Design a protein around this ligand. Structure first.
Ligand code: UMP
Ligand code: UMP
Ligand code: MG
Ligand code: MG
Lengths: 196, 196
């Protein structure tokens, strides 16, 4: 009966944060050690750089804290096509669910403009900003972060782990489902939820 | 057992949108007819001005679309004290739930900064931006808008209508509860939900 509501995360799922961060880092700090994408481990890139050398955490953070960083991210391959297709499905509801930096200044407005520019005004209406995704109601949350925590102990959604460089090597119990890319069968996953 | 989660709306509840809009309108359009606060009817002030004279809708909208408008709103009387007290209550969870203008440019960043400045960094962590409040999970939604609509037919929260100039005269069925101001007994309302 109900439409299936799909919460789609922004960084790592629609917007290519990892590519944008590396390219920005190499351009700004061309003499510093970097972490190639294939070597990324763990959600927070600043913490990986920090573990390489403590001051690199602040340097890498200065890249994503800069004006224009979020504005100019390239889309994840296939994301715009998939989201448009998903959005057009009957009895299917799409929201974009994104966590802004606590340093919100050059992040929150740029995320709105990114959606307007890469997807369209129609998608801006479906943006949800939150630091706690567990209080947002949906059937699915497609998100590259491995451990999603918040105040709601049993969220209404099932978390589908979207594959990204930083979570590629992560071993998950078989109860946890992954989306390998937008070319993996996200449609079937949506149908699995309609069925229950 | 559960904490009680309270969603507190921003415009009309924490931030004095109506006062700020009238003062901005009289300062910018000193020769135009205005709507005194006591005469406000209906949620959308632009539509009331528009019904007075069609071009006044665009003039009044230009006020809340201006840089600095959201940044500089004065707090609703008693709001900062009540939210701090509420936030400190045991087994009580507070989020700030606000709908940004579709013209997001001078709205979304300014709302974040407003919370940082009037409440504090600790409250910025609890901001939720959404155009659909029905998909946010809470026990209460304290909100001045009279008809809250969205995709979720039966929201998890009970809507407590926060009294504002524009909804003062609105007749509500007795099943709908109101908060007359922050000096009305919002604590008791929270206890009524803990009880169920
Ligand atoms: O190295 C990193 C990686 C991500 N983030 C923050 C940036 C975004 O604000 C937020 C992305 O969160 P998600 O919505 O993708 O969970 O994570 C960082 O601060 N540092
Ligand atoms: O005359 C008005 C009154 C309010 N709003 C918009 C401004 C805010 O973005 C939003 C406030 O929504 P709430 O979160 O308070 O429901 O309403 C207008 O566009 N015009
Ligand atoms: Mg992400
Ligand atoms: Mg309001």
């Amino acid at each position: 009966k109900r439409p299936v509501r799909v919460l789609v995360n922004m960084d790592g799922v629609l917007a290519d944060f990892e590519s944008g961060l590396l390219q920005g880092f190499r351009r700004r700090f061309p003499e510093e050690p970097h972490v190639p994408l294939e070597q990324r481990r763990g959600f927070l890139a600043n913490e990986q750089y920090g573990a390489l050398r403590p001051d690199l955490a602040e340097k890498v953070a200065s890249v994503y804290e800069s004006p224009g960083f979020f504005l100019n991210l390239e889309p994840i391959p296939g994301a715009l096509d998939a989201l448009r297709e998903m959005n057009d499905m009957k009895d299917t509801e799409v929201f974009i669910c994104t966590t802004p930096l606590l340093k919100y200044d050059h992040c929150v407005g740029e995320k709105y403009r990114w959606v307007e520019q890469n997807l369209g005004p129609e998608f801006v209406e479906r943006i949800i900003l939150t630091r706690d995704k567990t209080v947002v109601m949906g059937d699915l949350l497609i998100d590259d972060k491995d451990n999603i925590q918040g105040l709601e102990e049993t969220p209404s959604w099932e978390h589908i782990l979207f594959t990204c460089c930083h979570n590629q090597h992560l071993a998950l119990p078989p109860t946890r489902r992954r989306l390998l890319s937008w070319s993996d069968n996200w449609r079937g996953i949506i149908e699995s939820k309609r069925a229950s």
